[PDB]
């Protein structure tokens, strides 16, 4: 049983999640299921269908000067566009977490710096199935096999995220669960360089307490779902560590793969 302060915390977090993220899991699983529409997303499964999809995005590609780059680099820069959007939504989501905006501003930066990509890859699972992922707000679907076919190092970006997502999606979380999980990821007291550690730990303790009780009520037949999710948090930290390493390889070896400045700031001296 949840007391009123805990129910209120979970409600504010869930409402903040619904307000700030355009794509969520209920919407994604409607589209992926084909049970609400006979007009499925456009499928990008090879270079021909990539270029076709890119005809819709010509204004964006020309605006950012990438229309003539190699296909893998065009894709990489479109991935960056989605990441920058999601970081922006995650920052608004974070400010809706009671207590977050009251932290030292440098601690807010640190929590976002280390947390955003953990949250991004957790939420990315919602739009992934074993065969590919939704893109462009659910209007296209890019195949896992197409992503594997890109030249190294770009074929190494998404496949470990699909691997994580297939295991994560088997937990059958809904949006109410994911919103608390993401809040817990952001409010992590173990990040490097945090100043007010004890205070952030107490914030996290409250959110993780609500997460645990919520999972016991929402998934009573998956008794150790909360421990399973604590483990997924550790898996995500490792996933992002490896991701940053690959991003560093791309910056040092790929002259056409400029990082958006916001992402450059996130990755700078990260791990």
């Amino acid at each position: 049983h949840m007391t009123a302060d805990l129910k209120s915390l979970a409600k504010r977090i869930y409402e903040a999640y619904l307000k700030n993220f355009n794509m969520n899991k209920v919407k994604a699983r409607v589209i992926l299921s084909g049970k609400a529409s006979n007009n499925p997303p456009f499928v990008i499964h090879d270079m021909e269908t990539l270029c076709m999809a890119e005809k819709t995005l010509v204004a964006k590609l020309v605006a950012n000067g990438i229309q003539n780059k190699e296909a893998e680099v065009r894709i990489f820069h479109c991935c960056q566009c989605t990441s920058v959007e999601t970081v922006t939504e995650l920052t608004e989501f974070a400010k809706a977490i009671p207590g977050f905006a009251n932290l030292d501003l440098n601690d807010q930066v640190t929590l976002l710096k280390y947390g955003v990509y953990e949250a991004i890859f957790a939420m990315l699972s919602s739009v992934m199935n074993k065969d590919g992922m939704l893109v462009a707000y659910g209007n296209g679907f890019i195949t896992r096999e197409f992503l594997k076919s890109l030249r190294k190092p770009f074929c190494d970006i998404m496949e470990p995220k699909f691997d994580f997502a297939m295991k994560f999606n088997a937990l059958e979380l809904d949006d109410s669960d994911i919103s608390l999980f993401v809040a817990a990821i952001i409010c992590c007291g173990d990040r490097p360089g945090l100043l007010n550690v004890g205070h952030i730990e107490k914030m996290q303790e409250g959110i993780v307490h609500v997460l645990r009780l919520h999972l016991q009520s929402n998934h009573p037949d998956d008794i150790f779902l909360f421990p399973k999710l604590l483990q997924k948090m550790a898996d995500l930290r490792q996933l992002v560590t490896e991701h940053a390493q690959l991003v560093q390889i791309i910056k040092k070896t790929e002259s056409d793969a400029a990082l958006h400045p916001l992402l450059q700031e996130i990755y700078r001296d990260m791990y």
Partner: peptide
């Protein structure tokens, strides 16, 4: 900091 700018923005 670009992150600080996002963090200091008024609620939408």
């Amino acid at each position: 900091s670009l992150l600080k700018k996002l963090l200091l923005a008024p609620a939408n």
